[PDB]
């Protein structure tokens with residue numbers, strides 16, 4: 238089997254991407270944030286505290302003839318941005334782009350943090366990291382990819398995120414029309430539950446490539462590119478008037494600037510992030526200070542190849558017995 242679904246930026250800055258997901262019988266279609274940095278499929282629901290729902294589409298398990306309460310199971314997750322959600326668990330039929338999993342754990346939110354409530358466009362998350370991070374207790378549950386894997390033509394999914402445009406998530410096949418050149422594969426560590434890999438280095442604009450190992454995660458659920466402070470300083474030093482602002486919470490730059498590109502290494506290959514991809518617009522409406530798309534990881538504890546980086550590539554999440562990541566230009 239295979240699946241193919243379009244992923245659409247939630248706003249004009251590509252702050253996140255939503256992909257329609259069919260849940261239950263008859264189908265209830267929710268727009269979920271596909272997150273290769275977490276392992277829970279959770280949704281706004283008929284159980285979510287009413288005051289915490291503000292425009293999201295909800296899953297109502299009582300209206301699904303295939304929904305089953307997973308008795309005694311609860312979940313609770315806290316994300317790197319400080320947001321959180323928790324609730325109980327159903328199993329139900331979940332389809333993405335034509336690919337169907339029966340008995341998928343659908344984590345029904347009873348509580349969500351303010352950032353979730355405040356974002357009307359995201360109806361929940363679909364985690365695509367390794368199932369070892371799944372928060373369901375007392376019986377840990379499998380991701381949608383882990384449940385689908387054995388049925389897929391090839392045990393892979395691919396992320397093809399658009400810059401200011403829709404893109405695609407494919408399951409079970411590699412669309413050889415979707416990228417240029419060849420796919421470079423690189424080793425993955427699953428020891429922290431993430432798609433964790435080591436970049437071979439970077440370049441700023443037309444600058445010379447610096448060969449240096451940068452361990453980090455491929456995380457579709459994080460907007461920006463978070464890298465060591467040395468690398469980030471080298472980038473923003475090339476932008477007149479750029480500075481790190483403690484009050485704003487990262488590097489800002491004059492909105493009048495033309496940003497340089499950023500290149501990262503994948504083995505001997507190179508992925509180039511155009512400068513425009515690094516512009517996240519005014520810090521506040523009407524400001525001439527713009528927020529940068531490359532930020533320090535120093536306060537995180539891990540480097541994160543988020544959407545800014547991943548949207549410059551066609552990315553293969555290879556779930557073979559030994560997982561690997563693939564990157565191609567496009």
Ligand SMILES: CS(=O)(=O)c1ccc(CNC(=O)NC[C@H]2CCOC2)cc1
Pocket residue numbers: 253270272274316317318319320352353356359458459460463537541
């Ligand atoms: C409420 S929301 O904006 O829809 C949302 C979606 C997904 C995550 C998962 N990503 C994440 O935690 N990234 C961590 C990085 C960003 C900061 O700290 C480092 C968090 C929040």
